[PDB]
Design a protein around this ligand. Structure first.
Ligand SMILES: O=C(O)CNC(=O)C(=O)O
Ligand SMILES: [Mg+2]
Ligand code: NI
Ligand SMILES: [Zn+2]
Length: 331
């Protein structure tokens, strides 16, 4: 068995190897990458996502989200308070202000210590989930707006034609902006490209150990657990590495820098934070190996998780028993 310790693997494809996206994902899995739940891909040195970022300041962040924490430093939830619209140029200037900027630090480790000590005492503003792309249309390799769609994968593997579309999303971050512990919708893959700015630190639990994280989360968030049988779908709960280690939960960590891709694999729980002003682009995707994970994915039916149009068909075809109840939550 390849990668039996479930370590995060780092790949350096050549420009030739960067042509065929599906084939490269399958290669990484042949080497055991998926067992970690997360992999890093460093693009060949010849590749670029676009020529420059000099002209992005006029993108609108229609609903910036203030991430307000409750709890203790290592075990907390966050709620998202909606703020007034602002441009990316306005948001960048806010990120760089004395109130929001990255503090002085020695290295990524010192920054990580400061994040876990102090996150709860501040409310950073995150421009998340903005439909759009920063890849140039002429970028032919690993262009996250030109991937094969999940609907087409389901049709190729299973023969059924379904409605829905699959487009990328932009994320504008600042110091302390946080992504809570989650797997993807329908336990899909994700791919995330850090276009510019400061790093993003990731934490991940191997897919084979995901249920250990869920059991800890039920213990740590006991009212949320009674409210919903899949409350991590709400994407609000944080648990620190120190708390995971105290409770014996297997995990790994890695920091993504600008110019690098990360892939999350089906049922790979992940969480993390941004170091400073940055912009990432991410999209969900599927492979043949995903189908069985999609059939078994948990679902929020309490109504809180409220998701995309295209998830309807996935539930309807892969999980017809749950359909009915899941759609009562969505309506
Ligand atoms: O970058 C972020 O805030 C969150 N991204 C992801 O969870 C992802 O790419 O799967
Ligand atoms: Mg612009
Ligand atoms: Ni994710
Ligand atoms: Zn729920």
């Amino acid at each position: 068995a390849q990668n039996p310790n479930c370590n995060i693997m780092i790949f350096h494809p050549t420009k030739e190897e960067f042509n065929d996206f599906d084939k490269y994902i399958a290669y990484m899995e042949s080497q055991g990458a998926h067992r970690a739940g997360l992999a890093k891909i460093i693009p060949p040195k010849e590749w670029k996502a676009r020529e420059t970022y000099d002209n992005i300041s006029e993108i609108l962040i229609a609903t910036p989200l203030q991430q307000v924490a409750s709890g203790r430093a290592g075990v907390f939830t966050q709620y998202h308070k909606k703020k007034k619209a602002m441009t990316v140029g306005e948001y960048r200037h806010l990120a760089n202000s004395k109130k929001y900027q990255t503090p002085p630090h020695q290295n990524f480790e010192d920054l990580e210590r400061k994040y876990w000590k102090n996150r709860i005492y501040n409310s950073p503003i995150y421009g998340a989930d903005i439909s759009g792309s920063l890849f140039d249309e002429n970028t032919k390799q690993w262009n996250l707006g030109h991937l094969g769609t999940i609907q087409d994968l389901l049709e190729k593997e299973c023969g059924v034609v379904i409605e829905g579309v699959n487009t990328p999303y932009l994320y504008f971050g600042m110091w302390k902006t946080t992504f809570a512990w989650h797997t993807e919708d329908m336990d899909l893959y994700s791919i995330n490209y850090l276009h510019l700015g400061e790093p993003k630190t990731w934490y991940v639990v191997p897919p084979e150990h995901g249920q250990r994280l869920e059991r800890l989360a039920r213990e740590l968030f006991p009212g949320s657990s009674r409210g919903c049988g899949a409350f991590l779908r709400h994407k609000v709960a944080l648990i620190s590495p120190t708390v995971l280690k105290e409770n014996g939960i297997p995990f790994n960590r890695i920091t993504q820098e600008a110019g690098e891709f990360m892939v999350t694999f089906p049922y790979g729980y992940h969480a993390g934070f941004n170091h400073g002003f940055n912009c990432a682009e991410a999209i969900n995707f599927a492979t043949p190996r995903w189908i069985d994970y999609g059939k078994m994915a948990s679902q929020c039916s309490c109504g809180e998780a409220r998701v995309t149009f295209s998830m309807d068909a996935f539930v309807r075809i892969l999980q017809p028993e749950r359909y009915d109840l899941w759609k009562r939550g969505q309506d």
